[PDB]
């Protein structure tokens, strides 16, 4: 059958090791921010109200 988007994607970045390392780098850069902030907003979301960052309001900006 016709090559999968993954298939041509091999012929792209994977087969060449430099570009391979490159996509590893950009991939790290995205996985960092996205997963990091995901763990942020989720951890903020689960045991809600235990957080003082939402309880800053008793004492902030008068």
């Amino acid at each position: 059958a016709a090559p999968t988007l993954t298939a041509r994607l091999y012929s792209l970045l994977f087969r060449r090791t430099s570009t391979f390392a490159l996509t590893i780098a950009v991939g790290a850069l995205f996985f960092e921010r996205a997963f990091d902030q995901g763990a942020d907003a989720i951890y903020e979301h689960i045991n809600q109200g235990k957080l003082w960052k939402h309880i800053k309001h008793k004492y902030e900006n008068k």
Binding site: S18, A21, A25, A28, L29, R33, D36
Partner: protein
Amino acid sequence: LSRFLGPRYRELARNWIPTASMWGAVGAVGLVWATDWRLILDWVPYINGKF
């Protein structure tokens, strides 16, 4: 030391430049990713770990 000089060597370096130059770019951007370098992070629309 003069041996480095040569007709193939010119063509050879010409050939090897893409692979090693790519590494430098990969090494540079990755090193920015590792030290979490500042001023370029200013220039990224997405990965602003700063508020």
